[PDB]
Amino acid sequence: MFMINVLTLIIPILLAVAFLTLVERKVLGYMQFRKGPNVVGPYGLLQPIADAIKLFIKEPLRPATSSISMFILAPILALTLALTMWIPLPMPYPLINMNLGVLFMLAMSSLAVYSILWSGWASNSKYALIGALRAVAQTISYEVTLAIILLSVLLMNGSFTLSTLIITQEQVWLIFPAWPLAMMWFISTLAETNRAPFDLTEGESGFNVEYAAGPFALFFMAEYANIIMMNIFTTTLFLGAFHNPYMPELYTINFTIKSLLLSITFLWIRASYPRFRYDQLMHLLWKNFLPLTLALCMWHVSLPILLSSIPPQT
Amino acid sequence: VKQDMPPVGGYGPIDYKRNLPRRGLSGYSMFAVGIGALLFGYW
Amino acid sequence: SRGEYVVAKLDDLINWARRSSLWPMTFGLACCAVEMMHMAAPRYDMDRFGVVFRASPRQSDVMIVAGTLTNKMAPALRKVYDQMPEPRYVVSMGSCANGGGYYHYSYSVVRGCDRIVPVDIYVPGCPPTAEALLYGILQLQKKIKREKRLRIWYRR
Amino acid sequence: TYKYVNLREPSMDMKSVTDRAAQTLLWTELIRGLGMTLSYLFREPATINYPFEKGPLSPRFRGEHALRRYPSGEERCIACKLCEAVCPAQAITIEAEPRADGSRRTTRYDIDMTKCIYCGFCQEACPVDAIVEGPNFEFSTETHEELLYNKEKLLNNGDKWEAEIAANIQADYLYR
Amino acid sequence: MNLMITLLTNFTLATLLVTIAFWLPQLNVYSEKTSPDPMGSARLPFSMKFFLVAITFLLFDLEIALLLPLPWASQTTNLNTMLTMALLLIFLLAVSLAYEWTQKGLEWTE
Ligand SMILES: CCCCCCCCCCCCCCCCCC(=O)OC[C@H](COP(=O)([O-])OCC[N+](C)(C)C)OC(=O)CCCCCCCCCCCCCCCCC
Ligand SMILES: CCCCCCCCCCCCCCCCCC(=O)OC[C@H](COP(=O)(O)OCCN)OC(=O)CCCCCCCCCCCCCCCCC
Ligand SMILES: CCCCCCCCCCCCCCCCCC(=O)OC[C@H](COP(=O)(O)OCCN)OC(=O)CCCCCCCCCCCCCCCCC
Ligand SMILES: CCCCCCCCCCC1=C(C)C(=O)C(OC)=C(OC)C1=O
Ligand code: SF4
Ligand code: SF4
Ligand code: SF4
């Protein structure tokens, strides 16, 4: 019965990642004054199915890897960590209702850089390894502002419990007291997922260009699971919805609409901006977001004390 | 003779300059709105 | 028999999925690149057919040779074609890719890209229009639709 | 008679400095760009439904070649080799002889469509409107030599497309 | 226990999809490929700057590790000391950032 709950979590994750690709191609079509896919299915609804069947019977590139074992373990780790970030998500009830769900998510997203690192070293190209090291350095850079923005917000929560974050936002959204944290958080989640304007794995060859089309589709679907997940986590964190404990589907519809609009905001940002040069997003992290994030971390430490609004522990 | 020609008075005027219409609030008003949202959230 | 029916339905499935998700690697060699970009432009929009805009060469399904293949770039074309995973296809766009074209008698031009790679669709024009190139891509999809891989495998 | 792009010295009073700082911190031009992209989201796209909807053309359009005939069945080509003399890519190969009734007619009229640059110098060199570059652009092949047209293929293209070619020439011959 | 079941299910689904993605086109008998990089054969040049940003991540991440018990630390009854040491740790992270700044450590990956 619990395994039914695990499958009703993880199989709709795979379906929503399948159709996020279609939604991205359609929304980027209409924002680029064209259509998206509308031939393959009715309104293109069979485009992800056709494309998945195409990729799973495409020939393997059959490369020379330094490690066979890390070449197998990098997609396994990417998919496993992409699926374990969902299990504490309170929507309105988490699958695993853990007391440190925020810190668990922060740790399991910190572990996601080994997929990039192991897949880069598993490729024998030195250029793929250099691009992998640039992607890892970008990601661990933006993890700093993830951790500190998240800490500064949870100073208003009182605990690392994700389910308490619904109770925190019953009177107001937490984007009202923490909109600078919210906007730096949103750009930091944009830079965690190698998402445009921070997609330097498509700027002129990434880390996973040496895989077959099947494992490349697995990396791709882990990345889009991370995108949908970080939008849901941002929605829980700043745009927390109303919850009737006798009608949980009201909260589910509300956070689902907000998370869809936030994922479409990711799609709409990649359809609007040029890329950063690599040192420019290093400049954006280390010289712009991190001083503001430390200043607001001091502010959200000292502000519940000066207003007498320290939240409860329990 | 019949030939592709402009009409009797010629064509009407054609816009060719920049038109970036200067929308949005001032900097004072935008910082005031953001600080007011901060104060509402803190309260 | 029953196995004949199963390989017929499975060939129909895999051919549907391969033709309905063609990913092109376009060689922007010469003027035909501009008309490929018009076949990607919002009037014609290859992406509504599932034909994405600028897939990377290690994951592409068709190689659209759009422009003049000179002798100095013939091994680069061959190397990219060798790096493409199967089933790979090659569309020859325009007269210089087809038969050398206006530079057929040149000292420096490969007389048609078919001397270097096997070619599936020859799209004629100088340049062929973006509608004519889209016609050639739909004819390539019809060529993939009538492939008989599992049926010939079941008969071999 | 000239203008200076990007020669504005920005105002340094507290109003304009606070405006630029609000633009930097509150990302006003980024929301402007998002608004323009959102404005295209709700426009009707420009995508026609090929193959069912076709791109607009004109009677001057230079597509697939055709040999034409008179309104009696006699072919117009009288073997004068002006089209292959003017041909900038030498796509046209012509051999001729007098046929059984003594008319000056071709026995070889080849057009290599993979040398052809589709510029239509042949149809304007032609003094009898025999060769035309017709309206067809959807004639892609699966084989290279299916684009090496002989006289039979060009005459069949003329018989196939004459009802359209003659009306395009009727639309355009007064400009010629 | 439910967490171990969930981790095992996620790992098993990931390993299953990886095995399917690595062995479903192996059933095809496509062809044997011979196929005889921007760098030609040159050794990987070390860059000091990537190592500096990785160590700067590690040091600020240790400072983050110190900062992580603050939502529980605000519940204390020694609030003046807690607030002083909290502002002092964020200030030392800021001073580490300023020293990394002003000695050109944040340059060409700024
Ligand atoms: C979570 C829900 C959504 C959240 C909001 C996000 C939605 C909108 C997203 C739009 C698309 C963004 C795409 C990526 C853009 C990346 C570039 C970018 O913006 O860089 C950030 C830029 C970077 O600066 P820059 O690069 O533009 O400027 C040049 C920088 N120097 C000078 C160093 C060369 O700005 C920031 O870092 C600002 C971050 C937020 C700051 C918030 C400040 C709040 C107010 C503080 C007080 C001010 C008043 C004075 C004191 C008053 C005291 C009472
Ligand atoms: C949480 C919900 C998630 C939902 C996800 C999916 C959303 C979209 C679902 C699909 C919508 C309808 C798509 C219909 C496609 C067209 C099918 C069709 O008609 O194919 C015709 C083809 C040839 O037929 P033929 O007889 O030759 O035609 C000549 C007629 N004179 O015949 C064939 O090709 C053979 C028949 C193929 C039929 C395929 C139909 C679509 C399959 C979709 C599978 C997944 C559906 C969702 C599963 C979960 C919910 C139940
Ligand atoms: C190359 C190898 C393969 C790589 C791919 C697979 C591995 C990577 C992806 C999976 C990562 C596994 C993470 C396991 C622990 C996660 C942390 C954790 O347990 O947090 C949840 C929770 C803490 O919150 P709390 O509510 O306080 O505890 C319950 C008290 N009421 O604590 C609990 O609820 C406690 C539950 C019981 C304890 C669970 C212990 C799990 C088994 C040990 C680790 C197994 C994995 C080892 C390898 C990890 C990665 C290297
Ligand atoms: C368990 C398998 C589920 C289906 C596989 C993932 C969903 C299909 C995504 C297909 C896809 C699309 C549309 C796509 O556009 C794309 O290119 C950017 C991919 O990466 C190679 C893709 O993988
Ligand atoms: S076939 Fe002609 S128009 Fe096309 S790329 Fe070649 S030279 Fe340019
Ligand atoms: S269109 Fe030009 S290149 Fe083609 S056959 Fe006529 S004259 Fe020769
Ligand atoms: S097609 Fe015209 S120009 Fe060419 S040989 Fe015949 S009559 Fe002369």
Q: Three-state SS across chain D? A: CCCCCCCCCCCCCHHHHHHHHHHHHHCHHHHHHHHHHHHHHCCCCCCCCCCCCCCCCCCCCCCCEEECECCCCCECCCCCCHHHHHCCCCCEEEEEEECCCCCEEEEEEEEECCCCCCCCHHHHHCCCCCEEECCCCCCCECCHHHHEECHHHHHHHHHHHHHHHHHHHHHHHHHC
Residue nearest to atom 6 of ligand 7 (CA): D77
| Atom of ligand 4 lying closest to residue A221 CA | 6
Q: What is the dihedral of CA D69, D73, D79, D80, to 10 degrees?
A: -50
d(CA A283, CA E108): 9
Q: What is the dihedral of CA B25, B30, B32, B35, to 10 degrees?
A: 160
In the chain, the amino acid numbered A162 is L
User: Resolution to 1 decimal, in Å?
Assistant: 2.7
* Contacting partners of chain E (3+ CB pairs under 8 A): A, C
Q: Which experimental technique did the depositors report for determining this structure?
A: cryo-EM
Q: Which pair of structure tokens corresponds to residue A145?
A: 């502002």
For tokens 């060699």, what's the residue? C29
**8 A C-beta contact, residue C141 and residue C105:** no
Residue D83 Cα, ligand 5 centroid: separation in angstroms?
21
Q: Which pair of structure tokens corresponds to residue E45?
A: 């040049």
**8 A C-beta contact, residue D58 and residue A46:** no
**Ligand 4 lined by A211 (C-beta under 6 Å):** no
Residue C31 Cα, ligand 7 centroid: separation in angstroms?
29
**8 A C-beta contact, residue A83 and residue A6:** no
Q: What is the number of other CB atoms lying within 10 angstroms of the CB of residue A5?
A: 15
Ligand nearest to the CA of D83: 7
Residues with CB under 6 A from ligand 1: A 180, 182-184, 186-187, 197, 234, 238, 269, 273, 284, 287-289, 292; B 31, 34-35; D 24-25, 27, 30
Instruction: Map residue C28 onto helix, strand or coil.
Output: strand
Instruction: Tell me phi and psi for residue B7, to 5 degrees.
Output: -70, -175
- Pick the closest to residue C141 from D51, E65, D99 (CA basis): D51
- Pick the closest to residue A157 from A145, A169, A149 (CA basis): A169
In the chain, the amino acid numbered E68 is L
- Beta-sheet pairing, D92-98 with D104-112: antiparallel
**8 A C-beta contact, residue A274 and residue B13:** no
Domain ranges within chain A, ordered by starting residue? 1-314
Residue D46 Cα, ligand 5 centroid: separation in angstroms?
26
Q: Which pair of structure tokens corresponds to residue A77?
A: 């780790």
Using a CB-CB cut-off of 8 Å, the residues of chain A touching B40 are 172, 176
* Contacting partners of chain D (3+ CB pairs under 8 A): A, B, C
Looking from the CA of E92 toward its CB, the CA atoms found within 13 Å total 13
In the chain, the amino acid numbered E47 is S
D35 Cβ neighbours under 8 A, 6+ residues apart? none
Q: What is the dihedral of CA A129, A74, E34, C82, to 10 degrees?
A: -70
Strands of the D92-98 sheet, one edge to the other:
D92-98, D104-112, D148-149
d(CA C17, CA A161): 45
d(CA A109, CA A105): 6
Q: What is the dihedral of CA C108, C113, C116, C117, to 10 degrees?
A: 160
Burial of residue D76 (CB within 10 Å: 0-12, 13-18, 19+) is middle
Chains C and B touch (3+ CB pairs under 8 A): no
DSSP 8-state assignment for residue C93: E
Residue A4 Cα, ligand 6 centroid: separation in angstroms?
70
| Sign of the C-alpha dihedral computed for residues A59, A62, A63 and A67 taken in this order | positive
d(CA C113, CA D68): 32
Cα separation values, C101 from A172, C32, C93, C94, E28, Å: 70, 12, 11, 8, 38
Start-to-end CA span in chain E (Å): 45
Largest CA distance in chain B: 81
Backbone Cα Rg of chain A: 20
**Ligand 5 lined by C132 (C-beta under 6 Å):** no
- Pick the closest to residue C55 from A220, E99, D169, A179 (CA basis): A220
Is A34's CB within 8 Å of D37's CB? no
Instruction: Tell me phi and psi for residue E86, to 5 degrees.
Output: -65, -50
Backbone Cα Rg of chain B: 26
**8 A C-beta contact, residue C36 and residue C130:** yes
For tokens 């003779």, what's the residue? B1
In the chain, the amino acid numbered C20 is S
Residues with CB under 6 A from ligand 3: A 73, 76-77, 80-81, 84, 98-100, 104; E 3-4, 7, 11
Is D43's CB within 8 Å of A29's CB? no
| Atom of ligand 4 lying closest to residue E17 CA | 1
Q: Which pair of structure tokens corresponds to residue E73?
A: 């630390």
Cα separation values, A224 from A21, A79, A299, E38, Å: 8, 10, 34, 30
**8 A C-beta contact, residue A36 and residue A29:** yes
D80 Cβ neighbours under 8 A, 6+ residues apart? D104, D127
* Contacting partners of chain B (3+ CB pairs under 8 A): A, D
**8 A C-beta contact, residue E104 and residue A273:** no
Instruction: Tell me phi and psi for residue A310, to 5 degrees.
Output: -70, 120
Strand partners, D93: D110
